[PDB]
Structure 1
Amino acid sequence: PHARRALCLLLGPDFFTDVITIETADHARLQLQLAYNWHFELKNRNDPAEAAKLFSVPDFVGDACKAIASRVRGAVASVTFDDFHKNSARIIRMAVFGFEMSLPKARDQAVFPQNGLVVSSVDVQSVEPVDQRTRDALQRSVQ
């Protein structure tokens, strides 16, 4: 909640080293890491009010990560795990922002009107079930 304290609020292209515990309709406790490729869109840099709207949030990383976390977990909770382990990267990136683009694939941009924060990409690398016996049983599935 409060670990790093610095005056230099980074706004350039960067990321968030985030990991989340989630549950889907079939209840296998799963922990996933998120990347949250983010940057700040300030269309009028010289504007004092719009520049001051940047610090309206006290924890931009916290708000963004928890919001995308809720968007992940609520949508996964409506999918079964085998469909999830089949089609995760798609559903997790479509449910967190946007709508149909081509039913169809989602966008690749997540704007926050409170401050100007935007998340461009959400990368995932570690889909790992939490319970040991789940992984033991699905080891049988592969074997």
Structure 2
Amino acid sequence: LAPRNKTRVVSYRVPHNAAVQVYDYREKRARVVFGPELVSLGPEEQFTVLSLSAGRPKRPHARRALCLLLGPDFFTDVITIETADHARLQLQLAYNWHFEVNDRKDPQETAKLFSVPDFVGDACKAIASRVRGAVASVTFDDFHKNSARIIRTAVFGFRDQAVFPQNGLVVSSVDVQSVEPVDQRTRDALQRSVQLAIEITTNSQEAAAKHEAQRLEQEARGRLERQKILD
């Protein structure tokens, strides 16, 4: 809102469960700060700016940051897959992730947190491909039914977590949230499938009632005919 005084030492409060990277171009010296601290630029120090993917159907270069959110969060993506039957499906998925940071004082490890430029879109496309592959070898019915075990193994190959060793990300779970045929005429063909399923249960009570009607009607006739003879 108001022009900042440029003669003032430039500081930044780093949020909890995050990290910034700052390089000193004069003293030729690197550092990465973790967590809830305040970081102050020197005369010639600079921040790294991270350009990240954002959006529903994730697009690169939609968000910009100075701190890397290390901490456990999720991000959500919309995929389009296709089955061995050529049924075109649209999926809502969510990825629980975090950064294992073995040693925070280790300058060689800690720099790798910033290796992969766009760690969001990297894990999206790298998982969205693992899912499109397994499901073209699987049929629709099998997938409409086992979508949860299918997708889990396509992501976690022979395994509770997918590690990405370049930067150290992991993905501990995938929540599948919606599976939909793209085309409407496919959704109609699936609509007549349930109208039948209903009539199959109404026909079964009407046939189970009739069999009980016919059983009792005979238990009377058995006695009414025996009673006439005893008279």
Report the TM-score, using the length of structure 2 for normalisation. Answer: 0.57
The counterpart of 2:142, out of the listed 71, 83, 103, is 83
CA deviation string 1:82-106 (max 9, x = no partner) = 000010000101111231xxxxxxx
- Whether the 8 Å CA contact 1:16–1:37 is kept in 2: the answer is yes
Secondary structure of residue in 1 paired with 2:80: strand
CA deviation string 1:90-134 (max 9, x = no partner) = 0101111231xxxxxxx2201001100000000011111100001
- Whether the 8 Å CA contact 1:98–1:109 is kept in 2: the answer is no
Stretches (4+) displaced over 4 A: none
Q: Over alpha carbons, which structure has the higher Rg?
A: 2
d(CA) in 2 for partners of 1:15 and 1:49? Answer: 27
Unaligned 5+ segments in structure 1 are 100-106
In structure 1, the partner of 2:61 is: 2
Percent of pairs with identical residues: 94
More strand by share: 2
Unaligned 5+ segments in structure 2 are 1-59, 195-230
CA deviation string 1:39-83 (max 9, x = no partner) = 001111210110001110111000001011000000011100100
* Coordinate RMSD, CA, aligned: 4.8
In structure 2, the partner of 1:104 is: none
Question: Mean Cα displacement is larger for which, 57-66 or 89-98?
Answer: 89-98
What is the Cα deviation at residue 9 of structure 1?
Answer: 1.2
- Whether the 8 Å CA contact 1:24–1:76 is kept in 2: the answer is yes
Count of aligned pairs between the two proteins: 136
d(CA) in 1 for partners of 2:103 and 2:152? Answer: 29
In structure 1, the partner of 2:172 is: 120
**Relative contact order higher in (CA < 8 Å, ≥ 6 apart):** 1
